[PDB]
Amino acid sequence: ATLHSFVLVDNGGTGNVTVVPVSNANGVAEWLSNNSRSQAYRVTASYRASGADKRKYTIKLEVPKIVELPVSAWKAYASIDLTIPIFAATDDVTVISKSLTGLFKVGNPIAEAISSQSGFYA
Amino acid sequence: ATLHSFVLVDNGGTGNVTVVPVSNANGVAEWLSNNSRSQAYRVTASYRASGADKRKYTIKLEVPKIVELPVSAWKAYASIDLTIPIFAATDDVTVISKSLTGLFKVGNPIAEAISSQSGFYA
């Protein structure tokens, strides 16, 4: 099942965040941490076709900060649109995922930049 | 230096993909694999202010899959927009990354969905 509960944040066992499936309504897949709107981790995902030869994916993530904001959004917002051409059932496309996870890997440039409130400097 | 070479694809030593900073054209960052246009792994990144109290990140990725298309290609295209408000120097926001990786961690609903050329079903 593609729609199943998963650890979104892995702190190594203690302080893990689990998002559970709460909807699959007319296209949109929705995951949600067991919190109140304001404090909940969110994941939304759709899957459609882009023109003739490709498939499109629209993912959205909302992560709250620990620490004006009754129900107000002191959340970080992410939006991903991955457009991949249709491939034969025998092909291996694990690549894109490993590249995505490679982007946000801790100790990597971009991962490091998001943490310093910094840009990309030489 | 945020503009520093990194491993985007980690295959456990043999067949890793290193991306090197090639430009920083007065804004956008750009990492490329030592390959000809057609076959290279590509990364880009902007960093700008979104209104009064937040900042935005604009990341795009091109994942060539060795799989008509000479210069045109079986490229997987990703595009991330990450809106994050202003946070104190002392603050820990590493949860953003941890979340980003979670989402694309292999063995997870999403990594699993982009493989089978599937959507979110039960």
Q: Please list every residue in chain A whose beta carbon sits closer than 8 Å to the beta carbon of residue B91.
A: 65, 67
Cβ separation B6–A98 shorter than 8 A: no
With CA atoms as reference, the chain A residue closest to B113 would be A2
Q: How many CB atoms lie within 10 A of CB A79?
A: 14
Q: Please list every residue in chain A whose beta carbon sits closer than 8 Å to the beta carbon of residue B7.
A: 102, 108
Q: At what angle do helices B95-104 and A109-116 cross, to 10 degrees?
A: 150
Q: At what angle do helices A94-103 and B95-104 cross, to 10 degrees?
A: 180
Resolution in A: 2.8
Domain ranges (residues) in chain A: 1-122
Chain A: give the shortest CA distance to residue B51, in Å: 15
Q: How far apart are CA A26 and CA B36, in angstroms?
A: 42
With CA atoms as reference, the chain B residue closest to A77 would be B83
Length reported for chain B: 122
Chain A: give the shortest CA distance to residue B35, in Å: 16
Chain B: give the shortest CA distance to residue A71, in Å: 16
3.40.50.2300, 3.30.380.10, 3.30.160.100, 1.20.1440.80: CATH of A1-122: 3.30.380.10
- Sheet architecture: strand order including A6-9: A6-9, A17-23, A29-33, A42-50, A54-64, A75-85, B75-85, B54-64, B42-50, B29-32, B17-23, B6-9
The answer to whether the CB of B31 falls within 8 A of the CB of A108 is: no
Which of A8, A66, A119 faces B102 most closely, judged by CB atoms?
Answer: A8
Q: Please list every residue in chain B whose beta carbon sits closer than 8 Å to the beta carbon of residue A43.
A: 103
Burial class (CB in 10 A: 0-12, 13-18, 19+), A29: buried
Cβ separation A98–B11 shorter than 8 A: yes
Cβ separation A87–B74 shorter than 8 A: yes
Q: How far apart are CA B40 and CA B34, in angstroms?
A: 7
A81: which strand partners?
A58
Q: How many CB atoms lie within 10 A of CB B6?
A: 21
- Determination technique for this PDB entry? X-ray
Q: Which amino acid is at B106?
A: V
Pseudo-torsion of CA B11, B15, B16, B19, nearest 10°? -150
Q: How far apart are CA B28 and CA B9, in angstroms?
A: 21
Name the token pair of A93: 């496309």
DSSP string over B35-48: S-GGG--EEEEEEE
